[PDB]
């Protein structure tokens, strides 16, 4: 008889409804349709197609789907972002990172659970672009706050794992006397950094290298930074190369630059902490973030574990801070300002 | 300042939270972890790993993620399905079809929007397995209802586009005198049909062929069916081969078998119908279904368009029915019982 | 041990969380705090208190609660509506009607279920004010559409059950030649109608009487209307007085005014229709509306039942319409344009 | 045109949909219909009406409403709880307390905001009954944990503000040597306590008085307790009588009973703590709880404020604990075990 089944089905597949919507919102941003709708205000599928080189029947399908979900409005003149659609704008970075960057990673979990199946891959270009969008809200303000508490002034900044160069673009626009150098291991991210830096008019003050963090420190680069930023880099080295390699990397920084100020941003691994995991942002962001870090060759550890690593590498903690409680009040994103002990 | 940003962020990325959960639920089913948890009641990660040949640290990560979302419970003895987790069981087919089958298709939409980029691909084995799970609730009862209104009795049943053979297994178990033949174009689905039929003990009464519908009708098969079931097949032929090809296919059926009873199940294309699109199941299922059918080489049309096609092919409508309002009350899934005019 | 209980509790009491939010949104509107925040943009609790004659500590409590839910933002200068708070503006009428008008009614259901316990009461002033706010979106445009399809032009309009007079104020502003008379049985609503009409500068063209519909038609009023609007009035008479009384009331209208055009708006009782009840607006609005009409002395019937009543009363149907599918696509709100047969 | 309005309306009035559902769930429990459906499994409206003395048409309305929301199932034999309906069972106390007890309080906020309008009233009988239901999960296990850490064993227990006597019934059943006395100021709650104690067969070991806490301590009662439980009582005295009155009350306890063990349960006022307020249970429960305590004559203060009050009253802290993180992981419900300094 299946009495009452339909009502249970609508609730039971609610995650599937939102799964498709998240992918569709990701494409709305990534394809530049969102920016086109902002610019035009109202656009017919024919006009959007001509501008972006798209096929009308596929675009009409995406537009009708988004209209049914309330992201778009449709009038005789075309489609427009609704108030709900406009409200998505600040969140672009999260969609680009988690859907663009990590959709393949989540999809690979079934096969990668098998003995010997290896680590899940990701689209590191989208991870970098997306995380840089996110960093405008959380990590860049945190880095700025810690930099203000260091002695002297920043004149030469080195950012390892720079993604598309957003930290360097923001710091260079706010602090005009700064000279900067960024290194990014992903080729696509490296190319996006060279383009963003050129678009912001900063190519004469900021240079980008296609390199990983450990290999950059071992290279014959000619730059004497007084600040080094390691934003979510150490947990990649920890997973890929091991704890002795992280300790040795940190020792090499202060051996080469004994008066340097280090700013390290890391995520505290509280995946098993019942109270922490009930916070709305812990469920929305950190629970999937922790899951991805079990399937990729990265290792998140606790605040106490990082403090032990810093001590073993011969570093002293100047101050520790978390993100503004207006943006992320979980206390899981922690920034450390360190110096040679 | 970003005043109040966090509250907006938690709401803004709610689709991303559910996107990861839908993928994780899909893997919970597809990897056979769900069936393992049902069988064991409580299983430690070590026990689940030994049984399914998995890696403990990756499995613990998936389990902790699902525990944080309330799908699993954790005690000193291990993990178990919660009441919420147990409640997901009937919906397995939807997760397998839409996530397993069509996740790649949704992910390809950005690139496939470009002029000349072609049709998005899918994992047709998972689409078939998943849709067959769904059909237990909606399409198999609808087919059974229409079959009861035809003259005479079914003795020889042909199912084109049979997926994993679920329609044939259910009809053969309910009606022991039936001899059946199924054709499935996807190799993986064909192999799953041969295995399901063997598992149900029906290999002596039901034969499966690896073939598409049009090519099967043109083959030298030796079977005289009195019923032919075309469950969501015609809209594939319509998209791939065109309307004259669908008309010619239907004419060939009644030319070869003039006394045959045809049962056709199709989805009415009401993607642009405001009232229809506000139904909870229209939003949860049909809105993504319509979107997928704009990106794949399949074409959904309206009830009136199908009736015109049937008339042009020389068929008469015996009766038309929709699914039980206990399972799907949208009126979008329509079954037609036809005969030669 | 209560393993996993908290996660189930947060979901289990979600209706309670939203119950308090709905009441708080209702007071935000009803107390004029919403209009104060629109006017001021940012207001400290001291400024809001001085303007509306409120107590600071109670207001701070309401504001902190709403801030926690994302409806308000707080800065050093005070509180303001967030984008989410601003987006609530069009829905004021629904909150005023269902919470202000009918909260007591829903709360009385337990006691009123008992044999001989009578009908639940309501705050008819808030029901009238709120329903008039709603009517701007659905019933006023429907009435306007039907009036345009009548053979005659409206010059003298009678609105029975006029609430706060919003139909008359809108029609009179749009159609300057109209003279109008409204009757409202609730004293509080009647007083709000006299005030709204005076505020809109329409007291010379619109008169309001404190009276129920049946008693108004039996009174010595001196007005010769060519249009009468009965917007959700007949189902009140049907419940309170019975079907013969509704038939007699309609017969009396066309006996007194044989050339009159009648516009009747009613809600189709589809409470037991599985497909209709899965529409998002059916669940949000019509399911509680049907419930309240089982506990108050009002009786909702079906479209066909109304058409039969009209035939018995000697009325002919000119045309029937439902609301615009941009505002309400359920087809449950129906308007009938009638004349004497 | 109101383009796209309906989609915004369905979301905008979601709090109203859940507001009516919460009230309907409250009555389902409070009227004993929930227990009737558990006992019968399937019940026709006629059978439920005969058993509880209800009117069939009003009951059918409530049942149809709940069926539409998925709480009930309907078959030819009658109505039954669905799996979703069954899952509500543990949450009865929250509905009884917040809806039964405090619905009137929330509804009174608009009028009580006015200068000199006084404190909002509540249904203290339902607050007591509901809070006692909740206490089975959080406060009773917390009290039991603290009692076990005292140097003495409990033989004579006094519970001030006992509600319906649930703490005493649970402790007395688990610990057969205990003699107990409870005081409850609300007459309805007092009568429910006398009945619960009689139903559990404990009238020979537990006596209940109709009295407030301060007046009980000033009375001529003849009982020498070695443990006193003050579960959410002190914040009532603090609001109603002031901080000197709370200090004097605590001093009087240890003057009359110098060897007594005191167990105090209080809610930490973190209403203004951004991170704490993003916890799912903080939003669902504590945010409305804080709001109600701004409109009633009760005053919630912080953990540190309570510890300072205890020091002033001449009490020493033996140990402090919060609730089990399986039931409430906010850390806002705190229990203190105290002795005379
Ligand atoms: Mg990482
Ligand atoms: Mg298809
Ligand atoms: Mg009514
Ligand atoms: Mg009634
Ligand atoms: Mg209290
Ligand atoms: Mg108070
Ligand atoms: Na890893
Ligand atoms: Na297609």
Curated annotation (Swiss-Prot), chains A, B, C, D:
Its EC number is 2.1.1.243. It catalyses: 5-guanidino-2-oxopentanoate + S-adenosyl-L-methionine = (3R)-5-guanidino-3-methyl-2-oxopentanoate + S-adenosyl-L-homocysteine + H(+). It comes from the Bacteria. Pathway: Antibiotic biosynthesis. Keywords: Antibiotic biosynthesis, Methyltransferase, S-adenosyl-L-methionine, Transferase. Optimum pH is 9. InterPro entries: MrsA, SAM-dependent_MTases_sf. One of its GO terms (molecular function) is S-adenosylmethionine-dependent methyltransferase activity. GO terms for biological process: antibiotic biosynthetic process; methylation. Optimum temperature is 45 degrees Celsius. Disruption phenotype: Disruption mutant cannot produce MeArg. NCBIfam families: ketoArg_3Met. Belongs to the 2-ketoarginine methyltransferase family. S-adenosyl-L-methionine-dependent methyltransferase involved in the formation of the rare amino acid 3-methylarginine (MeArg), which is used as a potent antibiotic against the closely related soybean pathogen P.syringae pv. glycinea. Transfers the methyl group from S-adenosyl-L-methionine into 5-guanidino-2-oxopentanoate acid to yield 5-guanidino-3-methyl-2-oxopentanoate, a precursor of MeArg. This is 2-ketoarginine methyltransferase. It comes from Pseudomonas syringae pv. syringae.
